[PDB]
């Protein structure tokens, strides 16, 4: 995370202060899919 | 405001194209940061003399 800021200033000298490096995101663990009756027991049987 | 995420929601398909507009993504942050940096300079000089 230190090396990515020096690429933002393009400089090898990094002045004393706070610099905003690229954002981070939390990433997803998994997908969650969540969802009468036709008379096939009355037709087929 | 993060241009990359705002414009393109979490999707590289849109993220790729954004690379073609160059600095439009970044320079906004530079503008906003340019604002937010001095926003504390305002409060700095007004209240703490």
Resolution in A: 3.6
Report angle CA B18, B25, B40 to the nearest 5 degrees: 160
- The HSE-up count of residue A13 (CA atoms within 13 Å, CB side) is 1
B29 in A contact zone (CB under 8 Å):
yes
- B40 in A contact zone (CB under 8 Å): no
The span from the CA of B49 to the CA of B47, in Å, is 6
* Contact of A18 with A34, CB cutoff 8 Å: no
Question: Is B5 in Cβ contact with A25 (below 8 Å)?
Answer: yes
Residue A8 buriedness (CB in 10 A; 0-12 / 13-18 / 19+)? middle
Q: Considering only CA atoms, which of A8, A12, A36 is closest in space to residue A23?
A: A8
Query: Within chain B, what is the greatest distance between any pair of CA atoms?
Result: 51
Q: Which residue in chain B is spatially nearest to A26 when comparing CA positions?
A: B10
Interface size, chain A vs chain B, as Cβ–Cβ contacts under 8 Å? 7
Q: How many angstroms away from the CA of B4 is the closest CA of chain A?
A: 10
Question: DSSP readout, B10-31?
Answer: S-HHHHHHHGGGTTHHHHHHHH
């Amino acid at each position: 995370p230190l090396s990515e800021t020096k690429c933002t200033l393009k400089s090898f000298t990094v002045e004393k202060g706070i610099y905003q490096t690229s954002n981070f995101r939390v990433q997803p663990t998994e997908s969650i899919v969540r969802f009468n009756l036709c008379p096939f027991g009355e037709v087929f049987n | 405001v993060d241009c990359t995420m705002y414009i393109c929601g979490d999707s590289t398909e849109c993220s790729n194209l954004l690379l073609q507009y160059g600095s439009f993504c970044t320079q906004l942050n530079r503008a906003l940061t340019g604002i937010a940096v001095e926003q504390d300079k305002n409060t700095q000089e007004v209240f703490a003399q």
